[PDB]
């Protein structure tokens, strides 16, 4: 279940953003819609979908059996194809296109409002759950470098009937 990860990166001459995959990267400071199927060719590396608790979707053949090639293999894709959590697994997804742009599809977990639960001006960036906060998941720093200074809190969020205990990154 690590083979599944899609790992195609080019090129890092400009920014060395790629390092972000392994550890914190010296990004320059400061520069700071449905979901279906994405080909594994343009994906480096992990794809994060939110329920809204963050979840990892690995490569699978279309459709839908999992592939343990690093994608790599041409058939490898990510099947998202999803509907909001009352009732669905996730609101939206974020990943990195191979050149190092961040691709977001679907909608942020905040969207439940309504209103006033999403950020004040609405969104180009991130899985917000609060005008000030977004979800914290292991590749957030890599996906959203601007959030490096964000404080982290333990947070309850209720979707439909289910209750999610999740970590949040706030201003």
């Amino acid at each position, epitope marked *: 279940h690590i083979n599944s990860t899609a790992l195609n990166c080019n090129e890092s*001459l400009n920014t060395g953003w790629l390092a972000g995959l392994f550890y914190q990267h010296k990004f320059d400071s400061s520069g700071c819609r449905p979901c279906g199927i994405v080909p594994a060719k343009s994906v480096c590396g992990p794809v994060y979908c939110f329920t809204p608790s963050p979840v990892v979707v690995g490569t699978t053949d279309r459709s839908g059996a999992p592939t343990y090639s690093w994608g790599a293999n041409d058939t490898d894709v990510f099947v998202l194809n999803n509907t909001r959590p009352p009732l669905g697994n996730w609101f939206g997804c974020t990943w990195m296109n191979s050149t190092g742009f961040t691709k977001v599809c679907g909608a942020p977990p905040c969207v439940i409002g309504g209103t006033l639960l999403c950020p004040t001006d609405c969104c180009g960036s991130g899985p917000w759950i609060t005008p000030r906060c977004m979800v914290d998941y292991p590749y957030r720093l890599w996906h959203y470098p601007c959030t490096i200074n964000y404080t982290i809190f333990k947070v309850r969020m209720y979707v439909g009937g289910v209750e999610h205990r999740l970590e949040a990154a706030c201003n």
Partner: antibody
Amino acid sequence: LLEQSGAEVKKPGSSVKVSCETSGGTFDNYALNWVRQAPGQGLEWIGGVVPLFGTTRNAQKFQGRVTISDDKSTGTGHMELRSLRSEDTAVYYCVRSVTPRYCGGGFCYGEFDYWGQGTLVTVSS
Amino acid sequence: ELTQSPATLSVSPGERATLSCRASQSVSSNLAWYQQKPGQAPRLLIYGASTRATGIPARFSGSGSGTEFTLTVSRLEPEDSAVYFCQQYYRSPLTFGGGTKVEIKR
């Protein structure tokens, strides 16, 4: 800042184990590669490993035997080469890389940032 | 798959020493220049064909793309007495250049 194991002599067909240590360790390195240098000829790439994915990659001349293990705990690298040849006699460099430029997958590619002291491996009876 | 020319260079201090690297197959910008001083391990001079590494003086200057590369040492100092190598990180097998030995004239 990268220290390698002391020079060794082994009979043809035997095995060598060369280590690597970092003082002070451990820093952010994503890949551990090895590059040997025969006195007659220029540098030759042996192989490498990215410890985060556990994916190894070698060259045709060493495809069968060599295994490179990178321990992240103590930041200690290891290259073991078995069934040595007379042309295997060279100065073996331990090299580590920070900042990838390309990933085929699993393996990642980048320039070599830090080299080791070098280890003279002598294959002689 | 890398050809460094010339094999041997000899040049006065304060003058420019240029080294050519030619790949048999295109390697885009995935080329790196290293310096090997007598009895020491190689030092990373340039990566990405023309990007200087940290701590390397501006007199060192990488150039070129595709199959065609050149390394420039503008203001030579006796410390530059070393053998310089080129190495590509593009194609499946990693390859080094033959290596150019640089002699400082005095």
